[PDB]
Design a protein around this ligand. Structure first.
Ligand SMILES: Nc1ncnc2c1ncn2[C@@H]1O[C@H](COP(=O)(O)OP(=O)(O)NP(=O)(O)O)[C@@H](O)[C@H]1O
Ligand SMILES: Nc1ncnc2c1ncn2[C@@H]1O[C@H](COP(=O)(O)OP(=O)(O)NP(=O)(O)O)[C@@H](O)[C@H]1O
Lengths: 168, 281, 259, 280
């Protein structure tokens, strides 16, 4: 057509605006911060599907980049990684039921595949091995957070956001 | 027992561009009387709203309300119990609500203040009837409702735990006249029931016809605090500090200017009907 | 609640798609090379640009501050690349060398010069200009498989509704707090489950504006992206040559010294 | 002659769902160059009317259905051409706003029609100038009062030069001063270009100044025509779900204590001069 249209598309614009705002704030306790940008990433997955999802994350990094820093930039490639997160949330969750097998396998991979490999690949811009050790230095979060994330994602998604999807 | 002791407020403090919401507010309010709040837009009246439930704290002075006292220092420690007394339903309360049903959403308020399940169940229906809608839809989900019902259940969820002081900003801002004189009736019926009511609306028709206290505001400054008479009577004054006469006061003043001077103090229409028999008398 | 832009009153900060493209060009110029003198020419040029603006230095610290730990962690750990290197003694393998610690000054200047031009961009210009700047970077790829009408449109809408979603967020925060919502507090679960009352009413308010905006859009005659005109229209004026000077003058000599 | 009519027809949303959402048979019409209010309780179907006329929504008969606006039958095709004779100012500007500056928003429809920019500039200047928004013309939506946001809404549609301006509760939550001005704006606008303003409002005091009003309740119209004859419907009109205006309640609250009632008589200066006469 191409797929979607206005009112499908104006919605896509309002749910990226969420994840540039979300990814700004962190909650968090004295014990651990676990910043919440991730809800934005998972929403783009199960609603708009995998392939619009990839288009969501890529744009959400460009959007934040104007009103915020990008902590650097541009890269380009930071945006590439911001993209791939929502996409593989699209798989396991789109045209797919609500199930415990779909959510957790998705959370664990986001950290390891895209978050690790790509973050392990971008400040790279040099040789790889100096890079792995800076991130190897940073791993604990990727051990703890994904697990609180699966609990959190179940409480949002099955947690009346998806049940309130309809209607309307 | 509302008291504001030299209380100002400044936005973005310790930062450049500090806009001032409130400048040296000094005043005290009657316990259990209808207190209207009015001004031009961007007066800072909505700031003042979240001041005495202590969502914001003063950057100067003292606020004594509900037997508490709110300093610039006062922390976030015991504000829980401050809010069972004072309550806000913000301009759009329809957007305030959630979960799977109407009943569990209103009891959410009392539940957060430690009501028993039984207590919260009965307290739920107790105020879901009081807001006059409805037997069957009490168990319905909150999201399929009309704008009349959506801004009811919200206003129930705020009233369900029975706040002693209740302050609502523009609660009728979107309703129809059947709604207004419905919703404005409950505010006045809760009032003589022994509870304070702050109400902030541009509408000057129900400010004169209902409210006892009115306190105007301009550029963060408190310009007048009085009965809706003292402030309303001076015509060109209301121009200078931008406000407006109610519907009665407008037409009477005009018929008076070329015409007869009745003994009012016009306020509400019943008194107007009194004022225009005396015309021939 | 804006960020960052102490862009007030001084000269330049002009022609964003020129400026943006430059910072994109400077990034990849650093990325390229090399052992010596190449790192000298790009570092001096990068420094030339930042006080050409006349910007208060204090703002540059704001961007490197979170990364400072990350800099000196990789820098010295690069040195201690187990052998590794390189030229001198003092001492082991496994330890410092005159060659080992120069490489660790290079990761410092690259990380700096990234976060200099990245800063110099994100500050001196304004968001709606930058949006029209990276609309230009998208311009060439149109006739590849991507409709640029849509990925230009959603950005435009997103940006405009980012603050007005933020304010309706805090309105929901305070509206719930006033009703006895307490957060974060709690621990783990419920800390957490207390986040949903700020989420779903934020979600459903998004639909209300989604419908309303799409409704109000179509009614004003929005058929599609194809076949419009444009109001905004950025222009190159005479200063344009200065970023092309930087671009072509630095990087012909930087490429010769590259190898 | 007459600008717009809705013949026998019915409508539903979202699509045909359960119980029976609809307006009704309706059987409704309005004259060229006349301000006409449309009133009913919340959920009486006042929004649909505006979107029906607009073309965004379609009726559920399509054989019986005829909605013709200045000589076009609506109905699938031709919808963008009927969409150019009408324009709509929705309540709550924030969501209805699109574009960076205000001079950006009000030329939107203009670039929808592929108007060259050299012309676009001139029109848009005059547009914001017309609505008094002149030197706020580089400002972004967030800075503007919801009142003056709804001035930018006006200049938006005023730009494409429509023959019918619908106001959908546009004035709803504004200042008293701000609600005063916006109508006096569109009322100024009306005489200038000779247009038709379909107002929709819950405010009954500004419905009194309509040329023709019409009431809509639960599905359908009950009474319609000149405000003079519609407002006297008294008791029933109260139970109907809406209410009395002030002058008419003044009539009512006078008579309640016995005082005389010469009627209709719907104005201000016409009252005030009549007041001299009754004093005698
Ligand atoms: N977050 C903020 N930061 C800085 N200044 C603010 C902020 N919010 C509001 N203000 C200022 O404080 C005032 C807000 O007044 P306020 O009473 O909230 O608006 P209002 O329209 O008059 N009342 P209401 O319609 O009920 O919201 C204005 O002068 C604003 O410029
Ligand atoms: N998907 C839908 N789209 C539009 N209207 C709907 C939809 N579903 C139900 N409706 C009904 O459409 C009716 C339109 O009435 P409406 O005109 O909104 O009255 P209102 O309360 O005064 N709001 P408005 O006049 O639009 O400012 C409402 O009663 C809704 O129940």
């Amino acid at each position: 057509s191409s797929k979607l249209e206005l009112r499908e598309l104006v919605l896509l614009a309002m749910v990226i605006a969420i994840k540039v705002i979300l990814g700004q704030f962190k909650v968090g306790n004295a014990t651990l911060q676990v910043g919440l940008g991730f809800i934005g990433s998972v929403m783009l997955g199960y609603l708009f599907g995998p392939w619009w999802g990839f288009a969501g994350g890529a744009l959400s990094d460009l959007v934040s980049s104007v009103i915020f820093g990008n902590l650097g930039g541009f890269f380009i490639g930071f945006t590439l990684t911001a993209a791939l997160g929502p996409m593989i949330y699209g798989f396991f969750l789109y045209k797919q039921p609500i199930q415990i097998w779909r959510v957790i396998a998705s959370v664990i991979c986001v950290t390891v595949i895209c978050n690790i490999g790509l973050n392990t690949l971008w400040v790279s811009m040099m040789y790889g091995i100096n890079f792995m050790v800076a991130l190897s230095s940073r791993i604990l979060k990727e051990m703890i957070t994904p697990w609180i994330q699966m609990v959190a994602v179940w409480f949002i998604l099955e947690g009346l956001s998806r049940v309130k999807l309809s209607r309307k | 027992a509302i008291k504001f002791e030299n209380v100002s407020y400044v936005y973005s403090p310790g930062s450049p561009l500090e806009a001032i919401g409130l400048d040296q507010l000094n005043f005290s309010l009657e316990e259990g009387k209808f207190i209207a709040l009015v001004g031009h837009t961007g007066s800072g009246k909505s700031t003042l709203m979240q001041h005495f439930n202590a969502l914001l704290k003063p950057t100067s002075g003292k606020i004594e309300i509900a037997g508490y006292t709110i300093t610039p220092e006062t922390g976030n420690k015991g504000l829980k119990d401050l809010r069972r007394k004072v309550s806000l339903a913000f301009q759009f309360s329809e957007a305030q609500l959630f979960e799977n049903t109407v009943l569990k959403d209103v009891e959410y308020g009392p539940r957060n203040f430690g009501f028993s399940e039984d207590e919260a169940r009965e307290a739920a229906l107790k105020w879901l009837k009081k807001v006059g809608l409805k037997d069957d839809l009490i168990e319905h989900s909150p999201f399929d409702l009309s704008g009349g019902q959506m801004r009811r259940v919200a206003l129930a969820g705020v009233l369900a735990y029975e706040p002693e002081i209740i302050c609502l900003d523009e609660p009728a801002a979107g309703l129809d006249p059947m709604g207004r004189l419905e919703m404005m009736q409950l505010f006045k019926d809760y009032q003589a029931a022994g509870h304070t009511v702050i109400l902030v609306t541009h509408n000057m028709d129900d400010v004169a016809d209902y409210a006892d206290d009115v306190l105007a505001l301009e550029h963060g400054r408190l310009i007048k605090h009085a009965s809706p008479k003292e402030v309303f009577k001076d015509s060109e004054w209301l121009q200078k500090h931008h406000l407006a006469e109610p519907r009665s006061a407008r037409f009477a003043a005009k018929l008076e200017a070329a015409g007869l001077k009745l003994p009012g103090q016009p306020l509400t229409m019943p008194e107007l009907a009194d004022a225009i028999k005396q015309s021939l008398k | 609640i804006g960020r960052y832009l102490p862009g007030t009153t001084f000269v330049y900060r002009v022609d964003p798609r020129a400026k943006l493209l430059t910072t994109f060009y400077f990034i990849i110029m650093i990325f390229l090379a090399n052992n010596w003198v190449s790192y000298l020419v790009i570092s001096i040029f990068g420094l030339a640009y930042v006080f050409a603006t006349g910007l208060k230095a204090r703002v540059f610290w704001d961007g490197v501050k979170p990364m400072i730990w990350m800099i000196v962690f990789t820098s010295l750990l690069q040195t201690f690349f187990m052998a590794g290197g390189k030229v001198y003694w003092h001492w082991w393998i496994f330890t410092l060398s005159s060659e080992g610690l120069i490489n660790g000054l290079y990761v410092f200047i690259r990380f700096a010069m990234i976060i200099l031009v990245s800063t110099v961009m994100t500050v001196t210009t304004k968001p709606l200009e930058i949006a029209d700047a990276m609309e230009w970077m998208l311009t060439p790829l149109k006739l590849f498989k991507v409709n640029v009408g849509m990925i230009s449109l959603v950005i435009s809408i997103a940006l405009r509704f980012v603050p007005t979603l933020f304010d309706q967020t805090v309105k929901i925060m305070n509206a719930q707090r006033s009703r006895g919502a307490d957060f974060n507090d709690g621990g783990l679960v419920k800390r957490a489950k207390s986040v949903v009352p700020m989420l779903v009413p934020l979600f459903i308010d998004s639909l209300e504006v989604a419908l309303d905006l799409s409704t109000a859009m179509e009614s004003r005659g929005y058929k599609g992206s194809e076949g419009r005109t444009r109001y905004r229209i950025l222009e190159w004026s005479k200063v344009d040559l200065i970023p092309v000077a930087y671009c072509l003058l630095l990087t012909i000599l930087m490429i010769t010294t590259r190898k | 002659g007459s600008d717009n009519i809705i013949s026998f027809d019915h409508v539903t949303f979202t699509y045909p769902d359960s119980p029976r959402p609809a307006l009704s048979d309706l059987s409704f019409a309005i004259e060229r160059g006349s301000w006409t209010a449309l009133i009913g309780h919340n959920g009486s179907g006042k929004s649909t009317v505006s979107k029906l006329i607009n073309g965004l929504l379609a009726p559920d008969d399509l054989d019986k259905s005829s909605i013709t606006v200045d000589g076009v039958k609506l109905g699938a095709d031709t919808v963008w051409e009927v969409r150019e004779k009408v324009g709509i100012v929705f309540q709550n500007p924030d969501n209805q706003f699109v574009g960076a500056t205000v001079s950006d928003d009000v030329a939107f429809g203009l670039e929808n029609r592929a108007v060259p920019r050299p012309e676009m500039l001139k029109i848009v200047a005059q547009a914001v100038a017309d609505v008094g928004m002149a030197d706020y013309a580089d400002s972004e939506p967030s800075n503007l009062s919801g009142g003056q946001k709804q001035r930018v809404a006006i200049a938006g549609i005023l730009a494409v030069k429509p023959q019918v301006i619908i106001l959908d509760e546009s004035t709803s939550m504004l200042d008293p001063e701000g609600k005063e001005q916006i109508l006096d704006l569109v009322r100024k606008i009306k005489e200038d270009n000779n247009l038709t303003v379909i107002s929709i409002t819950h405010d009954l005091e500004e419905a009194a100044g309509a040329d023709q009003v019409l009431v809509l309740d639960d599905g359908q119209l009950l009474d319609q025509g000149k405000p003079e004859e519609i407002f006297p419907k008294v008791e029933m009109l109260k139970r109907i779900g809406l209410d009395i205006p002030f002058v008419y309640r003044l009539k009512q609250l006078l008579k309640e204590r016995g005082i005389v009632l010469p009627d209709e008589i719907d104005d201000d200066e016409k009252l005030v001069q009549s007041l001299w006469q009754l004093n005698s």
